[PDB]
Amino acid sequence: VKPG
Amino acid sequence: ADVPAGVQLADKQTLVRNNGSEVQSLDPHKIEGVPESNVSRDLFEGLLISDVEGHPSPGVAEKWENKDFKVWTFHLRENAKWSDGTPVTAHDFVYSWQRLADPNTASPYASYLQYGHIANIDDIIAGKKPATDLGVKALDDHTFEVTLSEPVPYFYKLLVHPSVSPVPKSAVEKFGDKWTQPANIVTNGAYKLKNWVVNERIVLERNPQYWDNAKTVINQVTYLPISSEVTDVNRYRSGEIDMTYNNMPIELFQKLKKEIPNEVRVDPYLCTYYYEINNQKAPFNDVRVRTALKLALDRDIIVNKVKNQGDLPAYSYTPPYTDGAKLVEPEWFKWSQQKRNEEAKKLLAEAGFTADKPLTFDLLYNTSDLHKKLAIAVASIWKKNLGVNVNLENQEWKTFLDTRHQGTFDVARAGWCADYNEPTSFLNTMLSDSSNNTAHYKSPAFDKLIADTLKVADDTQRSELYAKAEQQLDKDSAIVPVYYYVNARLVKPWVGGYTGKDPLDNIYVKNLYIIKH
């Protein structure tokens, strides 16, 4: 997943 | 939630969490970030789930088995039901993995099925075979069999990810895009969606039909979309926020560690912060320009002086502490920064750019105080060290994601967190045809290395190939690695259940409880  | 003996719980069992930005979606087949996943783990439950120490554990499946890592059989619990009292069957999973795979769904995670190597995944994605061809089968209502093209020993590990969560045939087919509206949604996790107000809050409430309802303590959880880490921290301080998002403002962090030090949690996190280069656009399609930027960045200053929150300077994509990674530190990393700078000056010159006739480009970041602070620092260092002119631009989380995928950028702030604890969680993202490949990096050599990891005779052989695969990315300077994250957030004293011991930070609100205070 891509982290904010 | 497993409430200890000493513990005397509060009356109101409610929680407020900052979720960092407004989510892309609530549809499990349309998401890819951390924020989206936070909420999804609360609403939809797949085959397996992570326990409080981040280990795969029984979710909807009670027991499972494999025949040589190639055929996997899941035994679904008979008491699993949807939000509406309907049972969760093998058929729900059949339909859901098919929809995920379906080119029409256009999921940013369609490639997840490829990572697990489910029979026929290639052709489906390619559109040569219908999604109906997927190597998944409902043996009966409570038996879900998965057929793979190769032996994948860590297969079960992937299954706690939201993309492989079931979705309701009924709501989906009846409402389409509007299926996730509160009035129409059907969920199977510990919670149900009570309310959703765009750019304000998402409110979840206990799902009484959840099979594990007797162990759910928190009756209501509110997720906020605050992108300003400073605001988050203020509002937590006010006492409006129980658990902030795990992005700490560089400004206040030091302050915090001294005034409210038991509320500051800083744990190892399996994520890498990096600057992603669009590999397909000139002049970024040249390895010399890519390498110069990788080299001219001063990790020392950024990690240790600018940020200073405990992150580790990075030399790889895959964090060296991931389960099964045996990485080799590249020689450039072992040099002096001035040695790296000189090298860097040279590569760019060779490429045709000097401080006299410089390179200019855009540095994209998702709106954030933390990310803005950093990009400024980075643009400064590259100016200083390389004579390049960087133009800063910021976008909203969901816009930012879309740009990346579209390739309408130069250089972008990026981050990738593992979905499972194994090197392929990072590596698969760099596969040329990968749906998560936002670097727009395409290496047949890289592809072959990864592909080979599933054709090996043993485990050692596997890890050498993963080290070889990282050397290739680094060779190509696909990206600019910056740091290996720490998981740093503020948690109020009365929130029980937050160990900080899962390197994946796969928190489930059904696992926390409020203590009397």
Set down the secondary structure blueprint:
The complex is a heterodimer of chains A (4) and B (517).
Chain A lengths: L4
Chain B lengths: L13 E5 L15 H10 L4 E3 L5 E3 L2 E7 L3 E6 L13 H12 L10 H5 L4 H6 L9 E5 L2 E5 L7 H4 L10 H7 L15 E7 L3 E6 L13 E5 L4 H10 L14 H7 L4 E14 L9 H10 L2 H9 L4 E2 L17 H4 L2 H15 L8 E7 L2 H18 L2 E7 L1 H10 L4 E7 L6 H4 L16 H9 L6 H18 L2 E12 L4 E2 L16 E2 L3
Helix pairs in contact in B: 9-12, 16-17
Structural features:
heterodimer; A: 4 residues; little secondary structure; rod-shaped; B: D-Maltodextrin-Binding Protein, domain 2; Dipeptide-binding Protein, domain 3; six-stranded mixed β-sheet; four-stranded mixed β-sheet; 20% strand; binding protein; dimeric; peptide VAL-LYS-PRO-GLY; oligo-peptide binding protein
Largest interface: A-B, 4 and 22 residues
Q: What is the CATH topology classification name of the largest domain in chain B? A: Dipeptide-binding Protein, domain 3
Give the helix tally of chain A: 0
Over the alpha carbons, how many angstroms does the gyration radius of chain B reach? 23 Å
Number of helical regions of chain B: 17
The total beta strand count of chain A reads 0
CATH superfamily of the largest domain in chain B: Dipeptide-binding Protein, Domain 3
Number of strands of chain B: 18
CATH-scheme architecture of the largest domain in chain B: Roll
Biggest pleated-sheet summary of chain B: 6 strands, mixed
Overall number of structural domains of chain B = 3
